[PDB]
Design an enzyme around this catalytic site. Structure first.
Site, PDB file in Angstrom:
ATOM      1  NE  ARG A 193       3.879   1.912  -4.239  1.00  9.93           N
ATOM      2  CZ  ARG A 193       3.200   0.793  -4.245  1.00  9.93           C
ATOM      3  NH1 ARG A 193       2.815   0.288  -5.359  1.00  9.93           N
ATOM      4  NH2 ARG A 193       2.938   0.192  -3.139  1.00  9.93           N
ATOM      5  CE1 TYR A 246      18.790  16.741 -19.486  1.00  9.68           C
ATOM      6  CE2 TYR A 246      17.138  15.059 -18.889  1.00  9.68           C
ATOM      7  CZ  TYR A 246      18.183  15.908 -18.533  1.00  9.68           C
ATOM      8  OH  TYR A 246      18.619  15.917 -17.233  1.00  9.68           O
ATOM      9  CG  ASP A 256      10.131  15.490 -23.710  1.00 10.75           C
ATOM     10  OD1 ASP A 256       9.714  16.628 -23.453  1.00 10.75           O
ATOM     11  OD2 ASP A 256      10.905  14.897 -22.924  1.00 10.75           O
ATOM     12  CE  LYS A 309      13.759  21.015 -16.553  1.00 10.15           C
ATOM     13  NZ  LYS A 309      13.741  19.930 -17.570  1.00 10.15           N
TER      14      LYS A 309
HETATM   15  C1  PLG Z   1       7.668  -4.741   2.879  1.00 10.94           C
HETATM   16  C2  PLG Z   1       7.284  -3.740   1.985  1.00 10.94           C
HETATM   17  N1  PLG Z   1       8.140  -3.325   0.985  1.00 10.94           N
HETATM   18  C3  PLG Z   1       7.769  -2.344   0.079  1.00 10.94           C
HETATM   19  C4  PLG Z   1       6.535  -1.739   0.156  1.00 10.94           C
HETATM   20  C5  PLG Z   1       6.284  -0.668  -0.922  1.00 10.94           C
HETATM   21  O1  PLG Z   1       6.293   0.632  -0.335  1.00 10.94           O
HETATM   22  P1  PLG Z   1       5.738   1.998  -1.061  1.00 10.94           P
HETATM   23  O2  PLG Z   1       4.109   1.924  -0.923  1.00 10.94           O
HETATM   24  O3  PLG Z   1       6.334   3.192  -0.441  1.00 10.94           O
HETATM   25  O4  PLG Z   1       6.064   2.014  -2.615  1.00 10.94           O
HETATM   26  C6  PLG Z   1       5.647  -2.144   1.167  1.00 10.94           C
HETATM   27  C7  PLG Z   1       4.238  -1.505   1.269  1.00 10.94           C
HETATM   28  N2  PLG Z   1       3.231  -2.519   1.641  1.00 10.94           N
HETATM   29  C8  PLG Z   1       1.928  -1.938   1.991  1.00 10.94           C
HETATM   30  C9  PLG Z   1       1.346  -2.785   3.127  1.00 10.94           C
HETATM   31  O5  PLG Z   1       1.481  -4.214   2.884  1.00 10.94           O
HETATM   32  O6  PLG Z   1      -0.009  -2.402   3.333  1.00 10.94           O
HETATM   33  C10 PLG Z   1       6.043  -3.154   2.067  1.00 10.94           C
HETATM   34  O7  PLG Z   1       5.213  -3.614   3.069  1.00 10.94           O
HETATM   35  C1  PLG Z   2      13.069  17.705 -23.071  1.00 14.31           C
HETATM   36  C2  PLG Z   2      13.286  17.189 -21.792  1.00 14.31           C
HETATM   37  N1  PLG Z   2      12.696  16.004 -21.403  1.00 14.31           N
HETATM   38  C3  PLG Z   2      12.912  15.469 -20.143  1.00 14.31           C
HETATM   39  C4  PLG Z   2      13.715  16.114 -19.229  1.00 14.31           C
HETATM   40  C5  PLG Z   2      13.847  15.389 -17.876  1.00 14.31           C
HETATM   41  O1  PLG Z   2      13.142  16.106 -16.864  1.00 14.31           O
HETATM   42  P1  PLG Z   2      13.310  15.862 -15.247  1.00 14.31           P
HETATM   43  O2  PLG Z   2      14.704  16.620 -14.843  1.00 14.31           O
HETATM   44  O3  PLG Z   2      12.129  16.362 -14.524  1.00 14.31           O
HETATM   45  O4  PLG Z   2      13.509  14.325 -14.899  1.00 14.31           O
HETATM   46  C6  PLG Z   2      14.326  17.324 -19.602  1.00 14.31           C
HETATM   47  C7  PLG Z   2      15.259  18.064 -18.609  1.00 14.31           C
HETATM   48  N2  PLG Z   2      16.412  18.653 -19.319  1.00 14.31           N
HETATM   49  C8  PLG Z   2      17.199  19.569 -18.481  1.00 14.31           C
HETATM   50  C9  PLG Z   2      17.681  20.707 -19.386  1.00 14.31           C
HETATM   51  O5  PLG Z   2      18.204  20.227 -20.657  1.00 14.31           O
HETATM   52  O6  PLG Z   2      18.635  21.484 -18.672  1.00 14.31           O
HETATM   53  C10 PLG Z   2      14.100  17.838 -20.894  1.00 14.31           C
HETATM   54  O7  PLG Z   2      14.686  19.009 -21.333  1.00 14.31           O
END
Ligand code: PLG
Ligand code: PLG
Ligand code: PLG
Ligand code: PLG
Lengths: 396, 396, 396, 396
Positions: free
Chosen positions: A59, A112, A184, A209
């Site tokens: 993360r 967008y 953007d 894109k």
């Molecule tokens: C209870 C709980 N909730 C949420 C998260 C967040 O998950 P992500 O890393 O997928 O964003 C954790 C991770 N905790 C890490 C541990 O304490 O080492 C967790 O233990």
């Molecule tokens: C300029 C611009 N900025 C941001 C995004 C968001 O991207 P993500 O889908 O990865 O979250 C788009 C997508 N626009 C889609 C198109 O107009 O069909 C975009 O065109």
């Protein structure tokens, strides 16, 4: 060993990447891991307080994602990068990093739709206000600034209509008044436009894109000064959106980006031809394309873009119904959203994405009944043109 | 064909999944695509206004991610699911979906640190206030409620100390006073605890931990009523966090979850043994484990959990320095964060994650100098025990 | 640091694997690369003459594939391993490594059909003769040996009928007469049977089945002495079959194999129950299962297998037509080939894989009209049993 | 809907591919499955006897691999395709499909070393003889034919030296005398050379090189008439080599091949420049490049190739030691084998791959002490040239 030094193509291929140090593996390995192993208790404490390098947990950062981030930073001439789950997450992670309740944003109107809604209905619920302006008229941008304005936000060219925004001119207004510019840069990659070099502070991209270019990654990327990026990462992403990127998605997007220079060249050479054909067609009323001399900001376009891009909008004779017919009659062009893949894609935001969106909402918001957007892929232009020709002919 | 009907193991394997209809492919295909193709203009408009099924674009939904979401909904007895880039993104996407400026949250104090910071430093900047309570004492939860309280938030067992929170009792307080209960069910999977069946409204998981179970996915999942989920998706994820899940990450987590029942059984049978060994050890002062009779909430634990879980905390004779030595002396156990992988992991939040975090911050916040957290993997318990035994012996 | 030392479960999880040395990444990275980079000309020459370690190019070896190979070598108690594109490629790469024109093989008759055809129609075209025997009667094996016999080949239990072959007894005959024993250990993993410990020289597996265990990898693995393995690699695979394994496939199979111990335990405990149910069923005429006391080689089975396995064959009242009906009437069990996935699979080689294979070919070759093969997955046995019960009842 | 009809670029992007029928997913899904599910017993029997379409099991065929195979068949103008684990496996699966003991092959001498060894030391052990000729002199090919000659085998251009073989002329000799021509088309893709159109019967490729183009897939592909392909598949691959391709590897290679046209254009335009620079360099004695007018078969090259290719060989002033120095002094170019990736790669088969291969073996076999092979990637040619210039200058 410094990759900031080579020419732009060399950088697309090499920057951020090096053969794996313990094996020599030339492809950047997919570090599909959630966790990392410290060899000491004290080393685990060092890294965690931000006191030493490097990896702790996906993360927070990852060696695959790191390469992509260093690459894109290099290509945009930024200090650092931060990858994200989506382009939307690149934008919200940015602005929610920069903004608390009581702050103001000034935004282009012509952006967008999903960005529009975040700013329209979601930003103000956290007590962050947003004011919408025609960013094509930089005085409107000046006129809407306030003491609490933290950020000015733009897209160029503007997603629907391919209007432009003068970045350097907008940079100076935003800066004069103590605000950051956020641009953007999705419709161009950095191969085509480098907003940071024009004075912008932050560049965001949907890497979905062109940057990935292959229609199989959803992803985003943030580029800016190290100090902002560190916050975007250790707070905005770590704490707020949590929109981190799969190392697989990173590795695909590194793969995708190797061919950016040559795919952009071909996208843009193809689109130029198609646009010129569209211009000469008696059943096409208007064509929107930065490379056509009739473009209202053609000269602006000539100065801030190396290439006019792979996107064409155009209006067809007879509005909604003709556009529907045309879009139903293409055989090569694919009916889908998104853009910047290797296949030619076509969308009709009138019969389609905005059909039970009442006619009056629509027109205000730059969209016409006959408006069709083409994302021009890597097919032979003749084949695309003949498919277009056939379907247009069908439809009128 | 209804998978909600079979026994819990059958559901882990089958629910949300069916062989691919156009090919018969038994493994759920990886739909690693950004975009989808409509066969008509009108069908593209149908889907987009939410007027017909199904797919439009990966940020919005995807057939691979859909299976995982239907699976987890089934296992948690919820109506629907929504996958996310991270467990953090499952939590923020939830609460930022449910909360505007002026709202209040009541939270357990004893939660995951990154969740703590979001609530501590980030939530209030959007004008959303959070009050922290010892959720183990449900009166404290009642005492902190306000008219503007929208949500009560808990973890059980509580990440650091493995204290518990009575879900049914907390459900009724939160509900009586017009609030939703949100329960982070990460330390248990639904194989062990089903908060929804106890009256909770929303369950979130870091699928990074047990649900994926293999230490190579970062991901999260939200489970709840259809009406809330639809908002979490079409607004919270679509617009706000944009933390959508890679279909690869979905497909790995579907893979990972096939073995959930048997991995939980082995995690928990292994951990029970290790905990009993730790209890009998003269150099271990305290052991925190829901399956030990000396656990203060042992009976609560016996009623709301099918199994006591794979996590053990314990304190070693001699505090910070002994814990450092011990954690540096393990040979089998790996020094890393995260938990719920197939390898045994060990962390010493004292010499480590909280070392230049001044001694006084620490103690208030449930952590002792000697506190070690073990995530018990699938090794032979004897091997883990002997490694523990050796290193403890080393360290005291 | 030596993983050959820990208990068998610890080895399944740990052996062949270590955290990535330059990053600490706990999941084995996917080295999806074709090529490797040398830091000197002389180092490139060193490696290439086999004069130094390690990597040159993925057909030859790869760090991801290497881990899997070291793991499986450890679990089988062999010196080394070599992964392959398929289990078929593990067998042909083995025998085409060991055999030139003029050599002889003695083979079990009761083997996998695709292996049968390679030996039947393909081996002799290279002037390599094969003689087929009932390997259950080790005298038949002795009786068919010749001065030019290089290899004896067996499967145990035997794919269709689950008959067994006494490995130790077959080891000694083959060895006495100057031949290598090659044992396909696919139906058991090494968690269940270790032919090398019984005196076999080479073990092959379709890792597609149990070792990967997840129905999404096609792969194979060869285990044996270093000297043979080196030839199998630098000649048989490098030069002859070229059936090398994708590092992705390796990495999935490493993932799959973490849960081998617990998946085998559950497969086998489930199958025992189902087999006992099948035995007591008035419409089932015969049940083939190494764990039933009525198995003709039950004691042999008790000595060379830790567990009776996840495969059951059985015959249904009324032959071809009843078996067809039954196999068309299952609702939980999936109609498909392969075995050893987490879903319960069922095949009816009579109405199916051998239907326009004339009735007389069939019977000679151990197959009856009523014969059904079940691969028992990780569902609740009760659910499988009730599905079986329903469909059997349907069919008779 | 027929993709054989569009221009060659349109075909690279589209042919073999269509949006997923049950979802519209535009990226070809990764069907990472081992097995497929039949909906009836009789349908399972239909498919298995080859009596109906389509899928049964990944060793046999797969919808992801199928697309790649249909694509490449289209680009080569063949009837069908068959993908394989490696390019070596494309060659051996071909020739072991076509050959039994007693048959003869005539082969170019100037081929890839691993192909050479298969033919040298391995083919004759199955009683299949091979005779080696300078395929550049088609009379030598005629002179070595025999009544038992089943196949003539060539590469053009020839891996080491970039000499050519006249395909049409070789087609007619082989055919006149009742043999098939097999052409390894790896150094060109079909974008550059189409041997089938010149009268060859079978084309093989290491898709590892240009076709995938990204240095992260090991794979191969066979193209030819349906009747041969069916045997190559249902016998040669199913039974003999078992070298089937991972659907992930297929899906990467489909990804890789989208950009084939533009990557070839850039590879070849870059290499032309670099070759002309190498020609003008006083410290380079010889340059081997089909696009230089001084190439002995320049006109042949001009007729059977659309482009002269991305590979350059050259000799440096001062032999072994100068070549070693030069290859150790490049900073941009990477020291590695393989070719056809987006990075520029350089190999010195003298100081390197053939150093403890005695000087006399070497020279006979076309290799000089000063010979360096360059695979020219997508960097800016100026950057490559300056790196070359620096290192050459270093070395002499
Ligand atoms: C209870 C709980 N909730 C949420 C998260 C967040 O998950 P992500 O890393 O997928 O964003 C954790 C991770 N905790 C890490 C541990 O304490 O080492 C967790 O233990
Ligand atoms: C300029 C611009 N900025 C941001 C995004 C968001 O991207 P993500 O889908 O990865 O979250 C788009 C997508 N626009 C889609 C198109 O107009 O069909 C975009 O065109
Ligand atoms: C014993 C045995 N050996 C080898 C193989 C060949 O494996 P691959 O498919 O990976 O090449 C199989 C597959 N037998 C399939 C089952 O009878 O349905 C097998 O059962
Ligand atoms: C012409 C040719 N044919 C076949 C192969 C075999 O391909 P695979 O590695 O996918 O099995 C190669 C690789 N030749 C490597 C180069 O000379 O460095 C080749 O150059």
């Amino acid at each position: 060993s410094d990759c900031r030094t080579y020419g732009f193509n060399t950088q697309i291929v090499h920057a951020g990447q090096q053969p794996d140090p313990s094996t020599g593996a030339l492809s950047t390995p997919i570090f599909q891991t959630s966790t990392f192993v410290f060899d000491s208790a004290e080393q685990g404490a060092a890294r965690f307080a931000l006191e030493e390098s490097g990896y702790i947990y996906t993360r927070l950062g990852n060696p695959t994602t790191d390469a992509l981030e260093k690459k894109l930073a290099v290509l945009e001439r930024g200090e650092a990068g931060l990858a994200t789950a989506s382009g939307i997450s690149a934008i919200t992670t940015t602005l929610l990093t920069l903004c608390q309740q009581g702050d103001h944003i000034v935004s282009a109107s012509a952006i967008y739709g999903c960005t529009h809604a975040f700013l329209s209905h979601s930003m103000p619920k956290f007590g962050i206000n947003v004011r919408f302006v025609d960013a094509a008229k930089p005085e409107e941008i000046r006129a809407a600034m306030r003491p609490e304005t933290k950020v000015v936000y733009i897209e160029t060219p503007a997603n629907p209509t391919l209007s432009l925004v003068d970045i350097e001119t907008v940079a100076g207004i935003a800066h004069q008044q103590g605000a950051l510019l956020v641009v953007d840069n999705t419709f161009m990659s950095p191969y085509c436009q480098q907003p940071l070099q024009l004075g912008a502070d932050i560049v965001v991209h949907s890497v979905t894109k062109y940057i990935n270019g292959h229609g199989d990654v959803i992803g985003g990327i943030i580029v800016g000064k190290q100090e902002f990026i560190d916050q975007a990462r250790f707070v905005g992403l770590k704490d707020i959106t949590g929109g981190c990127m799969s190392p697989f998605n990173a590795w695909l997007t590194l793969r995708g980006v190797k061919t950016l220079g040559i795919r952009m060249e071909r996208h843009c050479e193809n689109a130029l031809k198609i646009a010129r054909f569209l211009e000469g067609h008696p059943s096409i009323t208007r064509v929107y394309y930065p490379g056509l001399s009739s473009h209202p900001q053609y000269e602006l376009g000539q100065r801030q873009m190396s290439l006019p891009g792979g996107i064409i909008s155009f209006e067809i004779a007879g509005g909604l119904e003709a556009g529907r017919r045309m879009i139903n009659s293409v055989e090569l062009c694919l009916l889908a959203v998104s853009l910047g893949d290797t296949e030619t894609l076509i969308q009709h935001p009138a019969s389609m994405t905005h059909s039970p969106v009442a006619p009056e909402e629509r027109l205000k918001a730059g969209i016409t009944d006959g408006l069709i957007r083409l994302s021009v892929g890597l097919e032979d232009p003749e084949d695309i043109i003949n498919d277009l020709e056939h379907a247009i002919r069908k439809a009128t």
